[PDB]
Amino acid sequence: PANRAYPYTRLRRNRRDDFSRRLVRENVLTVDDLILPVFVLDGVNQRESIPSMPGVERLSIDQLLIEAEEWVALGIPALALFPVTPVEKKSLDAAEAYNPEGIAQRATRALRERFPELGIITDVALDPFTTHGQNGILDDDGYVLNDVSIDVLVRQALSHAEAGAQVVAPSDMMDGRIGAIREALESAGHTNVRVMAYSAKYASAYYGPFRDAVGSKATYQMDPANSDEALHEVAADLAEGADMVMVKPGMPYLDIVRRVKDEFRAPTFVYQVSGEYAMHMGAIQNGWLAESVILESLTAFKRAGADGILTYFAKQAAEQLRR
Amino acid sequence: NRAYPYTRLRRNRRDDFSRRLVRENVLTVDDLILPVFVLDGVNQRESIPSMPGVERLSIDQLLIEAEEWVALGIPALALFPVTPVEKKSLDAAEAYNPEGIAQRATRALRERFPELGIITDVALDPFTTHGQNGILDDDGYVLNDVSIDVLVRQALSHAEAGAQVVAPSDMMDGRIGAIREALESAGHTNVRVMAYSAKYASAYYGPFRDAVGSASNLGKGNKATYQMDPANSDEALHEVAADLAEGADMVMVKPGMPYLDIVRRVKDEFRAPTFVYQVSGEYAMHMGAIQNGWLAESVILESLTAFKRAGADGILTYFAKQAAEQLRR
Amino acid sequence: PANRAYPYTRLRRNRRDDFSRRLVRENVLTVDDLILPVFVLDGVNQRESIPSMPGVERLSIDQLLIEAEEWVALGIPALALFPVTPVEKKSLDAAEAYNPEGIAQRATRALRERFPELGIITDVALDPFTTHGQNGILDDDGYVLNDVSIDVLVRQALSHAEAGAQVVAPSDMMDGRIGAIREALESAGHTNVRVMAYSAKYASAYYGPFRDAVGSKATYQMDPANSDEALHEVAADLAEGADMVMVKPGMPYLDIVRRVKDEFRAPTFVYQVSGEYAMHMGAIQNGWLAESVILESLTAFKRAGADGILTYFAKQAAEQLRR
Amino acid sequence: NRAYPYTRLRRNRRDDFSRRLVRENVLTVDDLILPVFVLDGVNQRESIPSMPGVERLSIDQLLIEAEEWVALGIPALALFPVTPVEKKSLDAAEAYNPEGIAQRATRALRERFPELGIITDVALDPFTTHGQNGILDDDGYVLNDVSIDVLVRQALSHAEAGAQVVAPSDMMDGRIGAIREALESAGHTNVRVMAYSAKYASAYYGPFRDAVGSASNLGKGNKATYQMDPANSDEALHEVAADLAEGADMVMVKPGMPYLDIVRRVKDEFRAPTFVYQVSGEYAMHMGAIQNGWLAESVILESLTAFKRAGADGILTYFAKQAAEQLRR
Amino acid sequence: PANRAYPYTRLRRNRRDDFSRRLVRENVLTVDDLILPVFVLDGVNQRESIPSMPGVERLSIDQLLIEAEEWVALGIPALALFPVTPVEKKSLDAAEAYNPEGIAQRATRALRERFPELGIITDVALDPFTTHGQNGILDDDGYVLNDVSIDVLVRQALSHAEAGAQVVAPSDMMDGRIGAIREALESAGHTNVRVMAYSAKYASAYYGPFRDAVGSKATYQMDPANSDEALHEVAADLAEGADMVMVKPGMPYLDIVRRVKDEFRAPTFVYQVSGEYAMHMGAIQNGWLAESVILESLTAFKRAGADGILTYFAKQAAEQLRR
Amino acid sequence: NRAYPYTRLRRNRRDDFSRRLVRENVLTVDDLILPVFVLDGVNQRESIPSMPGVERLSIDQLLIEAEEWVALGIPALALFPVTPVEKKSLDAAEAYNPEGIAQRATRALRERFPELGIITDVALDPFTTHGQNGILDDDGYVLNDVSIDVLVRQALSHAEAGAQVVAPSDMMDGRIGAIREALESAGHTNVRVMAYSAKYASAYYGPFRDAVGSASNLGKGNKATYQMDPANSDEALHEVAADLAEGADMVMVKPGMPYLDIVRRVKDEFRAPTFVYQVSGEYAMHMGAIQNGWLAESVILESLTAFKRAGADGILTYFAKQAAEQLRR
């Protein structure tokens, strides 16, 4: 407090003018904070609209390369790739995951060659490759087997490193998967490939639209009621070698972002998920909310402690920041 | 916890994109305040040898240069009048002259650039024959409360001239409260007070004394009875606590680079709007080295980034224009 | 706060007189805080001036011994040696580094014999010995190979211990190099040789003049924007066995010194680098700043939490402290 | 984290140079305050059997010895008058006598050694027939507020005599605020108040009582109704908080060595100028042991270093001259 | 603070009466806090006075058993044994240390048999058994060899456990000796033998009289200037398995006791050393200080955070507490 | 850090001597306060069925029993008058009757046992026809400030009777400050105020209501508008902070065992003299179980030790005599 008291202290003084608001402004969003998730199609010269994600398109790799030209020109530091697996590549083997000619691997090679400075974050998970939509070579009971699921994630991770990905991101919420991939990457010579852990991953309703986008929980994803638990999750991932840790979903979990940054003072990331994007975009299109909520929502992440934000608004935000 | 080689801190450093993602602090033009030395008269511009690249300017010239500063986005200027020798006195009356340089300059800038912040200097050092920041007793001691009376008159004259911020750099005890009371009583509800809270008795002020012309007046005189002992850190927290209690809208640590630890402690302890003055000597040291080819120009932004990393919200720096130019690229 | 309020509390009271200023003075610099870096030439009866470091001389070993007589008489506890490698001893083998007759090794033996109580801190690094100025048996891409660079640093470290150095200081910023040298020193019987880690080492412009002195970064040296990261760096070095940890450069990073001492309460050192020395010395010589800034700058390090300061002003400071 | 043998704490201890580099605290003469017992009369010097090496001195002799203390760099003395028996009374009026020993000694020292700090003792124990630090009621209880009235008069007389610091050792509640108010009202703006904040009801004061001549007056009397219970630590923090709020410039913990934990807590909690009195009994214990050949003289500096390590900024110690002499080497 | 202010708050109110002083009294010394160190002679029916420790006697084992009857009746929970080794049993072998018929071992057996509930803390150290007064099979340079010294301490520790000691206390300040003895005790089946580590052991002048008592430093004992260092020392001993940690000397280091208890919240002990005892006892005998300083000094240890106090005043204190 | 089997926590537990050495807390008689129910009249003793072993006593009988309590070392009693039904009223005037039971009992005990602490109860529940701790408005609400006026009169009457401590158990906002002001103004400088600070609206008070005879008056009435919601912990800290600011010498948490977490938080946050009342229901529960042979008598000391471990300095407990007896062995 410092015994600050009205009227000696009037907090409106600094708010009186733009210049003083700017001087005391505690946080600022910049393009350096933005990661753009992209849905990648197989094939050539194709784009598809996603009903529950207005404005977001699934893109074939050639189209991805065209759009990346502008993303790069805008300063967006990295993309997070999410392949849209053809149903015929799905299965049990769950081996389109480590397939060198799989969409993620092809997209990574293409982008790394064309835009060498652009960061590529690949998705380490099996569900986009399971006929049963499950992040595991599941058990005969339907429980997502933990350690066996981790086995799969490793070859996939190595395949991403082999394709040139600078960052692999296990989006799975299996216990101890960070250490396993880290060890594998180190043992294989991929010394500088980063591991972005989806550390505090909640069992959330906000993922709805993403499932629509990719064409695809309580026993592995965290209970939304729990906060302390998130700290234990992050601690474990850091101990296991993660270079960056993430809180998932974002705005509905800003308190978790704050606690995670405060507790560990580590590179902290946050995903503004499909559902968050869709509810904002829908309200803006309906004429219910001004466009300014986009930057307001992103500023919240910075204020809360996030270093980077995975957001489907990345291009629009970068354009506004440029302006 | 984190042990090598599971943890290799070089991974995030490997590439520009990851360095950008994890970068903890960034300097922007919103963090810059440009101090300016203001002359009397018309069409006057004077180079300062101990401050290479810095010029004293008459008000008309100040108005011309401000056009570029404003275009660059610099949010505020901090004005320092170069008082004519004949206007110095024992009573420092020129400090509250409605026609003093600081007052005239403020009125001119407020009219020409209404959105530009003007921070005036509340202190008697530019107006005394002896160069001390207050009024002297018969033993040569800078009287605290009697000095405050003059500082209050000065601050009121600045508010009347239209200054949005008055910045007491005097280091008298209790002056923030006295000034705040006076401002409130006079109806200057929104005039900010940027307290020079943890102001050190430093050797880094030399070039400024030349710039403003207080050097000859001060001679070999010191300010150890009011400016803080450089050895002291805890004392800084007590200084800031008092100024916040007394109504300051912003608190400042003075000099800058040689006191980054104080900036850090102050921001951490109080979570209040915190400044930091990169003083004349800091500017001169860096400029000298750059001009000799000893340091790359990049050191300017590195020095300024340090302030942000240390916890400062705003930086008084004679490099503000150069920095803003570099930032625009 | 303790509800301290003007005018019951007037902080100027203790400032009124020298005696009360002395009584409450929180920190004092002494000669026990000073480490003097020295540039050492090959050959005999030679000294060279360094254009960007006015007042600092490169010294042949015989000359170093002459000057050390006074450094020791002044109470300076330790020197940090930096050899000026002849271009013909440079290379790839990068093996002048562990050469028993290399400058550093020769200088160490000479000083240890003549001044047994004087601390000698040697520089564990390869760049002064690379034809390509790189702290590593570099890769074919130009990336400073981490683990392979560490291999080299070990024999060099052992060679320094073999020459009698009481402290070795890896100035390199390679991940996990402290543990490797510690293990090597322990395994070899050098139980009491100290390791002074350059822990929080920034990619800085302030090193300019040093490069001039020795005749010689973002992927290994730290981003000046980062503070939290410095804590993780120090933690790792302490876990790996460092006896002392250092923040590098100094004055532009005083906040880091403060955080490091507060967080770990370990022997903490700071380097007032060549650029800091040069900018101060230039201003003093130009008649822009009084000589008193030297002690002011050094006092700052103590106030900030430093136990020891590597400074090119060590002799001048010690002389003033003696006075 | 740190585990053997990666971490061997003996490494830094191996050599003098590394021990010096990592040494966390250092005692200097700037940390020393010398208490002195002052007699009435001329050419008087009296040995104190329970304080070997310490002498009571008349003012003329005090002035002579002070020459050496000042040459050694000792920043301040703390004066303790040895009140003549016939000047003791129920009302302790001698406490504020402008011609009392403390007042006369202060005037003499202020004139002879203008830079030397003089800390006077604000307390009524030397002036009462009963030896208590305040005025008694009909039940033999030391009245708080009535005592403060006398202490205020005393403190004002010290300020008038020129003392730069008054040090209330009385342990009345609220006396720091009362004295500060009085000093401020009288214009003694810069007179420091060194509060004996966490003052314990200790057995270590015996020799002092002999030195000052309050022993016979106090008899078997105690001070448990005002001096603190030695068992209490948290209470010390409340005592210091109040004295800071009330305006103390320095706060002190009393005795020293047997209360180093309190020094540590106080410095940690408040980050204010903290003192610590190495009392007569501490001095006597050490001196006795040294003179018997049981402890090496080195123990003097070890005892004083402890105070610095514990967090004290300044130490009242009867070893100040010896320490300063050893430090000069 | 809680905005407590005079005269609403008068701290003298609780001091007004004995009953309220008792109610708010924060700490109390009891016999449960006292450990009595005893100097043990070889032979029978002997006692010797120690010039620099007035009132303390060296005792032959039969005499020790006689005095222990009262120590036990007074409630003193434990003794710390210090044998007074005959010069002829001294040496190099330094093997009177692990001699089953050595004084410490004989005294332990005797006490354990006669007073089964009385705690016996033995001294693990070699110096009482070295002809050169050194806690190590020293080097040829005079440096107290660390690891080799630890070798000796282990058999001695086992010999104490074999004699029935419930607690062994390495008073040596060698790095990592706690782990070595712990491992040895565990490996040998001495599961419940406690290890009381002399953790923060200062190079002090206060040990003078003890050397007189037993008939016997900066490179192993801690610099009295250092406080943070004490925390690192204690942390290491706790990690190595110590059941109790000790600060040594006591009153001159009360701040360390406070920091150690606050930081680790572990069983914390403190030694009121020979020099502390002697200076108090001398002043009391000279008529300079009242006897009450004994309890005042011991109360300080409790207030500072000590759980147990090794003190030569234990009997006198226990007698007063009984009264 | 500590891992099995390097660390076996059972080692210190192996023997009584080591358990004693590491034992963190100890209960002593200095920690005990005995509440007593006082009857009007002469030679009256009445058993309380819901409080087995506890008797209401007339003053003459109280004086006789106090002889043993004092011999046992019990430092203080807390008096609770059993007000005759005909003395209850809307205005609770009996609360400040100089001839009320509490006042008479205090005078008698102060004369007979001058060193024994007497803590009187400041509250109107024993004196109102409705059993509430204050005065009611026309809506049946316990008026805060109007109640304070009566509590102040009561507290003054207790001070006049000689009580060393008044203990407001009313839970009106601001009453500690009002009472303190009144005590100070009247010259009762040293009368302690033991605030019932974090007083919960509990079901554990049943037997007390029987003991004092407020049960029939209260009927099914509640105190949720003034006593604290048992679910609330943070609120307790705000309650204590206010009472300390208002001048309380001691602060209390009420009930005890079911609120040990609050005792712990309160001691930790404020480091002030902290109490805790082991209430009638706690006593009854334990006594019932002991008498049924369900729990060993050892549970008494275990329950009391819990309070010390939780951070209490003193405990109000109807087991005080039994505990003191056991402690004497």
Ligand SMILES: O=C(O)CCC(=O)CF
């Ligand atoms: O769609 C979901 O349930 C969340 C996405 C994942 O969990 C990816 F492996």
Ligand SMILES: O=C(O)CCC(=O)CF
């Ligand atoms: O010159 C530099 O870049 C810093 C010096 C080092 O890094 C030494 F190995």
Ligand SMILES: O=C(O)CCC(=O)CF
């Ligand atoms: O006498 C000393 O130096 C201390 C005693 C020890 O160190 C015991 F092994």
Ligand SMILES: [K+]
């Ligand atoms: K800003």
Ligand SMILES: [K+]
């Ligand atoms: K970022």
Ligand SMILES: [K+]
């Ligand atoms: K000092």
Ligand SMILES: [K+]
């Ligand atoms: K040092």
Ligand SMILES: [K+]
């Ligand atoms: K108690």
Ligand SMILES: [K+]
């Ligand atoms: K104990």
Ligand SMILES: [Mg+2]
């Ligand atoms: Mg996990």
Ligand SMILES: [Mg+2]
């Ligand atoms: Mg101030």
Ligand SMILES: [Mg+2]
């Ligand atoms: Mg590192």
Ligand SMILES: [Mg+2]
């Ligand atoms: Mg007080």
Ligand SMILES: [Mg+2]
């Ligand atoms: Mg150790």
Ligand SMILES: [Mg+2]
């Ligand atoms: Mg309340």
Ligand code: NA
């Ligand atoms: Na996924």
